[PDB]
C-alpha positions as CSV (number, residue, x, y, z in Angstrom):
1,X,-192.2,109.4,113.9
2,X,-189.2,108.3,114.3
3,X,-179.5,108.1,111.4
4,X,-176.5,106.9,113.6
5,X,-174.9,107.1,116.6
6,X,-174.0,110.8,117.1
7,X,-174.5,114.1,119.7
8,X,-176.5,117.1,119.0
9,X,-174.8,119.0,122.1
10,X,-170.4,119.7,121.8
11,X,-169.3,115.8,123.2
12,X,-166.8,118.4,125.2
13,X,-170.3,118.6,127.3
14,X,-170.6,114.7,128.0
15,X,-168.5,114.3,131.6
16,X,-168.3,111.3,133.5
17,X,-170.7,113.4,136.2
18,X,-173.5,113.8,132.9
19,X,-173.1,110.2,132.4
20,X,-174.0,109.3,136.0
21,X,-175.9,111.9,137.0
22,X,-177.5,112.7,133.6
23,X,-179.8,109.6,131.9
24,X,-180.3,111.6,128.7
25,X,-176.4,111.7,128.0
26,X,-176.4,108.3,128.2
27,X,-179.4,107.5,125.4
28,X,-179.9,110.9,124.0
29,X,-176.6,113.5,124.1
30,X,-173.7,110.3,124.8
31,X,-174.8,108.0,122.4
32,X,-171.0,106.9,122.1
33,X,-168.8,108.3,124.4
34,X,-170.4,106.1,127.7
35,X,-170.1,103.6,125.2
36,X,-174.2,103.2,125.1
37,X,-174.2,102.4,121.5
């Protein structure tokens, strides 16, 4: 099992702490705003 790039969770959720701290925003939740995709 398996569209584009795009959130699931507000991207007003996504800080620059979520993308440093939290891996998941950064291939799962912030699939654009840390610029991963």
């Amino acid at each position: 099992f398996x569209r584009s790039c795009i959130d699931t969770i507000p991207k007003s959720r996504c800080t620059a702490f979520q993308c440093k701290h939290s891996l998941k925003y950064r291939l799962s939740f912030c699939r654009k705003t840390c610029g991963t995709c």
